[PDB]
């Protein structure tokens, strides 16, 4: 069987993408952020501290006939941006675009951090990374992709994110109309629990391709593209008036400038990110300094191919025994 759900940018900058997910019987639809950089299905539930909730839809397991408390289980997660959440774990029927998984761990948030509270449009996260990163103790739990994998026509899910437009998440099938040319597949390392791959190089605007290995993670839960300082500096050196502001916390550019594109290698193939995708608008309302879409990964310790890089491609996440990533033009 398959599943097809539409994903939509939360705001005018594509800061995140929410995808509708049905939890329980009768179903309750929550808008979850599909994150291929984490493996937890957590939601804002009726058990959250009423102070940490600001206009979000809440999962009410007491109003669900198929909800079972996963007795004793707890989860504690901290993200790359510094955000965090914790609580107890429930099991319930979860569906994504028609694809149903019965007995899926739905982590009820009892406590959420301030970044989550501010995001009223995001009701929780749907972890699509390897289940080895799941934070449920004492019994580690599997992701929705893992639980659905056996009943899927093909053990894959695809991400087709849009630039200032809605896109799609498909499960169990490859939509041959959603891309042009071929899908280039590349090896994935499951060691750190992420979809870890090696980019074959890069180019800045119409510059000559630089063939160099760049290990990274295909991460839908991260907004920007985070590459090594050497690669990012080469990119921002081609933008007039661009600098790395320590007060902003990253690279800024004059809003009047037209950004060049950024090409990243996938095997012998190339994925071109239009310069427009790299423009995150003014740093503050009315400002003349604009936030860059390419930032350095120096502090993170991992290079991240986030939404900036992924929305320029049709991306296949192959969860076969030998997992691989596929990138195609669109």
UniProtKB/Swiss-Prot annotation:
GO biological process entries: proteolysis
Keywords per UniProt: Aspartyl protease, Disulfide bond, Hydrolase, Protease, Signal, Zymogen
Top enzyme category: hydrolase
MF (Gene Ontology): aspartic-type endopeptidase activity
Domain of life of the source: Eukaryota
EC number: 3.4.23.22
Domain Peptidase A1: 17-328
Catalytic reaction list: Hydrolysis of proteins with specificity similar to that of pepsin A, prefers hydrophobic residues at P1 and P1', but does not cleave 14-Ala-|-Leu-15 in the B chain of insulin or Z-Glu-Tyr. Clots milk
Keyword Hydrolase annotated: yes
Annotated disulfide bonds: 255-290
Active-site residue list: 35, 199
Family: Belongs to the peptidase A1 family.
Full protein name: Endothiapepsin
Protein source organism: Cryphonectria parasitica
Residues of the full protein shown: 90 to 419 of 419
């Amino acid at each position: 069987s398959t599943g097809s759900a539409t994903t939509t940018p939360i705001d005018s900058l594509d800061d995140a993408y929410i995808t509708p997910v049905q939890i329980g019987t009768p179903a309750q639809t929550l808008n979850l952020d599909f994150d291929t950089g984490s493996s937890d299905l957590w939601v804002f539930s009726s058990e959250t501290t009423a102070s940490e909730v600001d206009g979000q839809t809440i999962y009410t397991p007491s109003k669900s006939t198929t909800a079972k408390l996963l007795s004793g289980a707890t989860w504690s997660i901290s993200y790359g941006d510094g955000s965090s959440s914790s609580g107890d774990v429930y099991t319930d029927t979860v569906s994504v675009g028609g694809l149903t998984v019965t007995g899926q761990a739905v982590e009820s948030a009892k406590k959420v951090s301030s970044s989550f509270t501010e995001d009223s449009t995001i009701d929780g996260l749907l972890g699509l990374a390897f289940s080895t990163l799941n934070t449920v103790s004492p019994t580690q739990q599997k992701t929705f992709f893992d639980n659905a994998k056996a009943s899927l026509d093909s053990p894959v899910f695809t991400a087709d994110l849009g630039y200032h437009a809605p896109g799609t998440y498909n499960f169990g099938f490859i939509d041959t109309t959603a891309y042009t040319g071929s899908i280039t597949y590349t090896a994935v390392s499951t060691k750190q629990g992420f979809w870890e791959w090696t980019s074959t190089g890069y180019a800045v605007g119409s510059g000559t391709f630089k063939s160099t290995s760049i290990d990274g993670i295909a991460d839908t839960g991260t907004t920007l593209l985070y590459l090594p300082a050497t690669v990012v500096s080469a990119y921002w050196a081609q933008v007039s008036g661009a600098k790395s502001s320590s007060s902003v916390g990253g690279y800024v550019f004059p809003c009047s400038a037209t950004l060049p594109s950024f090409t990243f290698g996938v095997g012998s193939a190339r994925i071109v990110i239009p310069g427009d995708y790299i423009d995150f608008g003014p740093i503050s309302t009315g400002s003349s300094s604009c936030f860059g879409g390419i930032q350095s990964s120096a502090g993170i310790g991992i290079n991240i191919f986030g939404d900036v890089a992924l929305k320029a491609a049709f991306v296949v996440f192959n969860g076969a025994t030998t997992p691989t990533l596929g990138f195609a033009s669109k």
